[PDB]
Enzyme design. Structure first.
Site, PDB file in Angstrom:
ATOM      1  N   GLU A 175     -30.937 -38.139  49.354  1.00  6.59           N
ATOM      2  CA  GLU A 175     -30.135 -37.483  48.326  1.00  6.59           C
ATOM      3  C   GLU A 175     -29.268 -36.369  48.892  1.00  6.59           C
ATOM      4  OE1 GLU A 175     -29.988 -38.841  45.438  1.00  6.59           O
ATOM      5  OE2 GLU A 175     -31.930 -39.402  44.613  1.00  6.59           O
TER       6      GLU A 175
ATOM      7  N   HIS B 211     -26.956 -40.082  47.576  1.00 10.40           N
ATOM      8  CA  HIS B 211     -26.862 -39.654  46.188  1.00 10.40           C
ATOM      9  C   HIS B 211     -25.706 -40.380  45.503  1.00 10.40           C
ATOM     10  CE1 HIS B 211     -27.849 -36.957  42.916  1.00 10.40           C
ATOM     11  NE2 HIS B 211     -26.642 -36.422  42.897  1.00 10.40           N
TER      12      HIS B 211
ATOM     13  N   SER C 254     -27.910 -38.228  38.380  1.00 15.03           N
ATOM     14  CA  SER C 254     -27.497 -36.884  38.806  1.00 15.03           C
ATOM     15  C   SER C 254     -27.494 -35.993  37.568  1.00 15.03           C
ATOM     16  CB  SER C 254     -26.167 -36.981  39.547  1.00 15.03           C
ATOM     17  OG  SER C 254     -25.597 -35.706  39.765  1.00 15.03           O
TER      18      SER C 254
HETATM   19  C1  LIG Z   1     -22.518 -24.619  45.863  1.00 13.08           C
HETATM   20  O1  LIG Z   1     -22.266 -25.994  46.100  1.00 13.08           O
HETATM   21  C2  LIG Z   1     -21.094 -26.148  46.793  1.00 13.08           C
HETATM   22  C3  LIG Z   1     -20.042 -25.233  46.693  1.00 13.08           C
HETATM   23  C4  LIG Z   1     -18.907 -25.457  47.467  1.00 13.08           C
HETATM   24  C5  LIG Z   1     -17.779 -24.660  47.402  1.00 13.08           C
HETATM   25  N1  LIG Z   1     -16.897 -25.702  46.833  1.00 13.08           N
HETATM   26  C6  LIG Z   1     -15.566 -25.753  46.829  1.00 13.08           C
HETATM   27  O2  LIG Z   1     -14.830 -24.864  47.256  1.00 13.08           O
HETATM   28  C7  LIG Z   1     -15.010 -27.028  46.154  1.00 13.08           C
HETATM   29  C8  LIG Z   1     -14.899 -28.218  47.134  1.00 13.08           C
HETATM   30  C9  LIG Z   1     -16.154 -29.123  47.120  1.00 13.08           C
HETATM   31  C10 LIG Z   1     -16.112 -30.154  45.979  1.00 13.08           C
HETATM   32  C11 LIG Z   1     -16.833 -31.472  46.356  1.00 13.08           C
HETATM   33  C12 LIG Z   1     -16.616 -32.662  45.380  1.00 13.08           C
HETATM   34  C13 LIG Z   1     -17.315 -33.977  45.779  1.00 13.08           C
HETATM   35  C14 LIG Z   1     -17.575 -34.905  44.577  1.00 13.08           C
HETATM   36  C15 LIG Z   1     -17.541 -36.358  45.070  1.00 13.08           C
HETATM   37  N2  LIG Z   1     -18.389 -37.288  44.265  1.00 13.08           N
HETATM   38  C16 LIG Z   1     -19.572 -37.892  44.620  1.00 13.08           C
HETATM   39  C17 LIG Z   1     -20.528 -38.082  43.596  1.00 13.08           C
HETATM   40  C18 LIG Z   1     -21.759 -38.708  43.929  1.00 13.08           C
HETATM   41  N3  LIG Z   1     -21.980 -39.110  45.190  1.00 13.08           N
HETATM   42  C19 LIG Z   1     -21.089 -38.947  46.175  1.00 13.08           C
HETATM   43  C20 LIG Z   1     -21.434 -39.409  47.449  1.00 13.08           C
HETATM   44  C21 LIG Z   1     -20.531 -39.264  48.505  1.00 13.08           C
HETATM   45 CL1  LIG Z   1     -20.937 -39.796  50.091  1.00 13.08          CL
HETATM   46  C22 LIG Z   1     -19.291 -38.669  48.287  1.00 13.08           C
HETATM   47  C23 LIG Z   1     -18.965 -38.219  47.017  1.00 13.08           C
HETATM   48  C24 LIG Z   1     -19.847 -38.341  45.933  1.00 13.08           C
HETATM   49  C25 LIG Z   1     -22.786 -38.930  42.950  1.00 13.08           C
HETATM   50  C26 LIG Z   1     -22.386 -37.918  41.944  1.00 13.08           C
HETATM   51  C27 LIG Z   1     -22.983 -36.709  41.831  1.00 13.08           C
HETATM   52  C28 LIG Z   1     -22.009 -35.723  42.056  1.00 13.08           C
HETATM   53  C29 LIG Z   1     -22.411 -34.369  42.067  1.00 13.08           C
HETATM   54  C30 LIG Z   1     -20.596 -36.060  42.222  1.00 13.08           C
HETATM   55  C31 LIG Z   1     -20.256 -37.599  42.273  1.00 13.08           C
HETATM   56  C32 LIG Z   1     -21.153 -38.254  41.228  1.00 13.08           C
HETATM   57  C33 LIG Z   1     -18.818 -26.590  48.275  1.00 13.08           C
HETATM   58  C34 LIG Z   1     -19.856 -27.496  48.382  1.00 13.08           C
HETATM   59  C35 LIG Z   1     -20.994 -27.266  47.628  1.00 13.08           C
HETATM   60  O3  LIG Z   1     -22.057 -28.123  47.678  1.00 13.08           O
END
Ligand SMILES: COc1cc(CNC(=O)CCCCCCCCCNc2c3c(nc4cc(Cl)ccc24)C[C@H]2CC(C)C[C@@H]3C2)ccc1O
Ligand SMILES: COc1cc(CNC(=O)CCCCCCCCCNc2c3c(nc4cc(Cl)ccc24)C[C@H]2C[C@H](C)C[C@@H]3C2)ccc1O
Ligand SMILES: CC(=O)N[C@@H]1[C@@H](O)[C@H](O)[C@@H](CO)O[C@H]1O
Ligand SMILES: *[C@@H]1O[C@H](CO)[C@@H](O)[C@H](O)[C@H]1NC(C)=O
Ligand SMILES: *[C@@H]1O[C@H](CO)[C@@H](O)[C@H](O)[C@H]1NC(C)=O
Ligand SMILES: *[C@@H]1O[C@H](CO)[C@@H](O)[C@H](O)[C@H]1NC(C)=O
Ligand SMILES: *[C@@H]1O[C@H](CO)[C@@H](O)[C@H](O)[C@H]1NC(C)=O
Ligand SMILES: *[C@@H]1O[C@H](CO)[C@@H](O)[C@H](O)[C@H]1NC(C)=O
Ligand SMILES: [Cl-]
Ligand SMILES: [Cl-]
EC number: 3.1.1.7
Lengths: 531, 532
Positions: free
Chosen positions: B324, B437, B197
């Site tokens: 992904e 992913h 990633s």
């Molecule tokens: C613009 O992008 C976004 C913007 C927003 C707006 N966001 C908000 O208000 C914040 C809340 C959303 C924050 C989400 C955090 C999730 C990180 C969890 N880590 C994971 C990770 C990975 N895989 C995962 C697979 C699953 Cl099924 C579940 C979790 C994984 C592989 C990784 C890559 C990552 C980016 C994070 C981490 C390591 C929400 C979603 C978006 O995609």
């Protein structure tokens, strides 16, 4: 008596013709307009002046002046489309086939030939009406109309060369049928107009045009529709091509009257010899002199008329062939040949899509290429060949027709859609060309019923079923006989979008003819090109 | 003795850990930089000043300050990614697993965690290096680096918050490995950096950056590449987001110095709480504070560097997972749920592609929709769901990586490409999410070898094969053992574009990974967006 018919313009004497061990009556070469010669070249047609005595209608008329194809001299596959009679500007005639004995008041079908608005004759062997008239007991008319510059030179604002006069020729022949077909045993209230290619576009154009709508009951469109990209031009582009025609002939270009006067003094073949030079681009499936969107024959744009429902509300039956594009590739694109499988190199594929979509900018060309290229296998000459074939047929015939059919069905009174995909057993063209533009016509006109032409027994059966669909639709607005035991051709509806294949196999019903590509051609690409 | 190592910055005392009925040495929590705290927040890292006495390296360090996911509290499938240690700005530490007995001079592999540059920890269970170090006899290092604003707030022209300092953290740890790994039995001339990633993107960025190229030998990129659309911003956009972060926190915005001074007085969680607010669009798979194309860490644009061959010429091994996109749809797009099959309506499909391609105009969205819609069957909720899944994964991971691999292979010295499409038997997430992913990492790190984790016997063999590919590549520049009798992973070449599937079945070779969709994402759509 049976062959002697008094019309509102004068008396006609037909001839008794053999057909499939029987006989019917033919009235060949009946004039319906004044000869559009001399100072009447480019002008709207005038009705034929009544004649005294008996018009001898035992002989086919002249064909209109047109570009004659010499790519394959003497080859039956191409000669069958060329004029088989002497060419003349004196060419506004129609032919009638009448069952014997004369019926009282039977269904009328009026054939409008195609040919890109640049060619066509009512007299071709494949348009012989006698098999359809005899087998289905209809009165079969074939009209004619001026083609090329003689029919569609358009200098908008001029009353001497207004444009669309070939469409007015068709309309005057329809008017003649309305006034006179009763004297031949035809019902003027049950006239179906049908045509292929430019004839199919024309049929849809009469559906659209208010001045045409009351001259027929219902319509059949084969491999053509009024919104096809080749079937009309704007008044500005029609004027440009007209001016460029005079420039190619050393004409005075300072006024319409001077340009028209110069062009009227040229011999017909002088105009024809430079006809193709006025096209704006190197292209295939584009023709020089076509109907103009003039504000008169067509009060507004075709798209706004289709959107508003401003067209004749009736029943239509229409459809396309599987490989509409192949003949245009053979004649106009690199790598294609009548005598080989025509596997297309990547470089010739790219040249072909530029010829096929001549109005496209580079981004539009990229979009077409991506939509029709398998990038796992981009050097496959068969896929490149068939991909280009599909491009030509989808853009020029299938998707325009599907746009029309969807807009029409919103307001119409019944739509029947077909997909003709039978390759004739005795086809003289190579296998790569598939089911070719124009080659459903011989089935519509019953030529497989002629033992000597060596169609198979199931091709005769297919021809008989097609003639019965067409004629039953003509008589009733429905190609099915509703109390029959046979498989039913379903209505095309906005929601379920059903069509049938026409071929020698038992009937199949499908939905959403070529929907994926036609989203591309009808929605996405126009939006890209307009950006 | 085996656990007591004298490094150039001071003595460290590791610990003896069990691994699969054996043991190896672990040195956990070794500092490689000065704590970037107080007035050193946002600044480039500084080398850790040498210490007297023995640094107790028996315990994992703190994790860097980061947004913590609470969507599914206590759910193992999400919690496995959250910090499992206390969070602190004092987080610039690395961990080392050394085979026992200490080898003389063996291959080194340095793991760079992912997490979108906003999250991640060296200490997650799935990053435990003991199985790979033991099984493949390598020295396994895992570094750390500041994420979020702390690592990537960029006010270009300021030397106080220049941007890219998280990448400079990674470089400082690579410099430390260069200088000290020989004391742990590692060969500093045979260091392979690998990451997933954002860690994969980071690996690619060190390949590009002149200041990084001499600190490693070879590279592995997992589900990430430097040119990914989420992985960098322009200096103008980085400055816009830094100012907007200040605006969210009532900061003086008249100058960099005043803005930075305000931001340095906030508590870490105060910055984190508003971090997502600075994104310019409603989107998924976009992150607020990411590397900046600054003219310093990156001398020119990524594409010009890729075109001119201005990058480290070496061997690379890289690849992607089948699905992904699914994680990002679950967390950010309407109609997706952990507890259902997530059939997607056409209305939610349309909303999804808008969230997935946030920078596209209406013509661009139309192009995406057409490319991924079956108009014979457009109300199929399964096709709508999988089409959205493909859009997200293709646009954000697969096609950017295929653009990188094609550009790199023109100048590089050896490319090996994989497609990981195995779904773990014990996967905790629903079937619709497919091969997620992040979920190749557990195979790379040998977790299937742990009987208590309940992988199948076939999955243990897949993990051992993957670990052996990775480490053999690290040792030699070729994942294949020379006179082995097993099927060979072919070089990816410009002409034949070969890659392998990684799953439980016998290895199959394919060509042109997702070539059709990546023509769309890599050539047509960019040309459309640039033209309209
Ligand atoms: C613009 O992008 C976004 C913007 C927003 C707006 N966001 C908000 O208000 C914040 C809340 C959303 C924050 C989400 C955090 C999730 C990180 C969890 N880590 C994971 C990770 C990975 N895989 C995962 C697979 C699953 Cl099924 C579940 C979790 C994984 C592989 C990784 C890559 C990552 C980016 C994070 C981490 C390591 C929400 C979603 C978006 O995609
Ligand atoms: C100025 O740039 C250009 C310059 C040119 C130069 N053009 C030329 O020199 C003339 C080329 C036109 C050749 C005309 C050939 C006539 C085709 C004969 N009619 C056919 C017809 C049909 N099908 C056919 C199927 C086969 Cl396989 C073969 C012939 C068919 C079905 C019909 C529809 C038609 C349009 C014509 C006619 C009836 C062309 C395009 C340009 O852009
Ligand atoms: C047969 C013929 O060429 N007739 C022309 C006519 O087309 C033209 O409009 C007219 C103008 O005076 O001059 C005639 O000689
Ligand atoms: C009409 O034309 C036909 C065909 O040439 C001819 O056989 C017939 O005698 C003609 N009848 C006349 C001129 O009265
Ligand atoms: C055609 O019009 C008639 C007359 O109103 C109507 O009853 C019938 O339902 C229509 N059929 C179709 C298919 O539109
Ligand atoms: C039909 O076939 C026969 C022999 O099979 C042949 O003599 C005849 O010429 C063919 N007909 C045509 C029109 O080619
Ligand atoms: C190092 O720290 C661990 C846990 O904090 C502790 O158990 C161990 O005794 C410490 N070692 C020394 C030498 O203090
Ligand atoms: C790598 O570089 C060496 C040295 O120039 C060369 O012999 C070899 O063929 C290269 N391998 C690849 C895959 O480019
Ligand atoms: Cl074919
Ligand atoms: Cl309907």
């Amino acid at each position: 008596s049976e062959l002697l018919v008094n019309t509102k313009s004068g008396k006609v004497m037909g001839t008794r013709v053999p057909v499939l061990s029987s006989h019917i009556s033919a009235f060949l070469g009946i004039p319906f307009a004044e000869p559009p010669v001399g100072n009447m070249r480019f002008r709207r047609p005038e009705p034929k002046k009544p004649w005294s005595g008996v018009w001898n209608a035992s002989t086919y008329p002249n064909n209109c002046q047109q570009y004659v194809d010499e790519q394959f001299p003497g080859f039956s596959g191409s000669e069958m489309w060329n004029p088989n009679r002497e060419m003349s500007e004196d060419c506004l005639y129609l032919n009638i086939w009448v069952p014997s004995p004369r019926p009282k008041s039977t269904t009328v079908m009026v054939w409008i030939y195609g040919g890109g608005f640049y060619s066509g004759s009512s007299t071709l062997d494949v348009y012989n009406g006698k098999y359809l008239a005899y087998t289905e007991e209809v009165v079969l008319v074939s009209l004619s109309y001026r083609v090329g510059a003689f029919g569609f030179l358009a200098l908008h604002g001029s009353q001497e060369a207004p444009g669309n006069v070939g469409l007015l020729d068709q309309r005057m022949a329809l008017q003649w049928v309305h006034d006179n077909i009763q004297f031949f045993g035809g019902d003027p209230k049950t006239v179906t107009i049908f045509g292929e290619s430019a004839g199919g576009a024309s049929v849809g154009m009469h559906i659209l045009s208010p001045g045409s709508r009351d001259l027929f009951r219902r319509a059949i469109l084969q491999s053509g529709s009024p919104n096809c990209p080749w079937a009309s031009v704007s008044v500005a582009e029609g004027r440009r091509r007209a001016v460029e025609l005079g420039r190619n002939l050393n004409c005075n270009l300072n006024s319409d009257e001077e340009l028209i006067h110069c062009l009227r003094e040229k011999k017909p073949q002088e105009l024809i010899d430079v006809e193709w030079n006025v096209l704006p681009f190197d292209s295939i499936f584009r023709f020089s002199f076509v109907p103009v969107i003039d504000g008169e024959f067509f009060p507004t744009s075709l798209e706004s008329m289709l959107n508003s429902g401003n067209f004749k509300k009736t029943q239509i039956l229409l459809g396309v062939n599987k490989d509409e594009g192949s003949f245009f590739l053979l004649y106009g694109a690199p790598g294609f040949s009548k005598d080989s499988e025509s596997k297309i190199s990547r470089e010739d594929f790219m040249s072909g899509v530029k010829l096929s979509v001549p109005h496209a900018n580079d981004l539009g060309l990229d979009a077409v290429t991506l939509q029709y290229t398998d990038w796992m296998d981009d050097n496959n000459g068969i896929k490149n060949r068939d991909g280009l074939d599909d491009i030509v047929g989808d853009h020029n015939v299938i998707c325009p027709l599907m746009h029309f059919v969807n807009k029409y069905t919103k307001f119409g009174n019944g739509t029947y859609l077909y997909f003709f995909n039978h390759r004739a057993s005795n086809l003289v063209w190579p296998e790569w060309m598939g089911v070719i533009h124009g080659y459903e016509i011989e089935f519509v006109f019953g030529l497989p019923l002629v033992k000597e032409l060596n169609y198979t027994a199931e091709e005769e059966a297919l021809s008989r079923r097609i003639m019965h669909y067409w004629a039953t639709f003509a008589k009733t607005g429905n190609p099915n006989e509703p109390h029959s035991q046979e498989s039913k051709w379903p209505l095309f509806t906005t929601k379920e979008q059903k069509f049938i294949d026409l071929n020698t196999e038992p009937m199949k019903v499908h939905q959403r003819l070529r929907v994926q590509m036609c989203v591309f051609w009808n929605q996405f690409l126009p939006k890209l090109l307009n950006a």
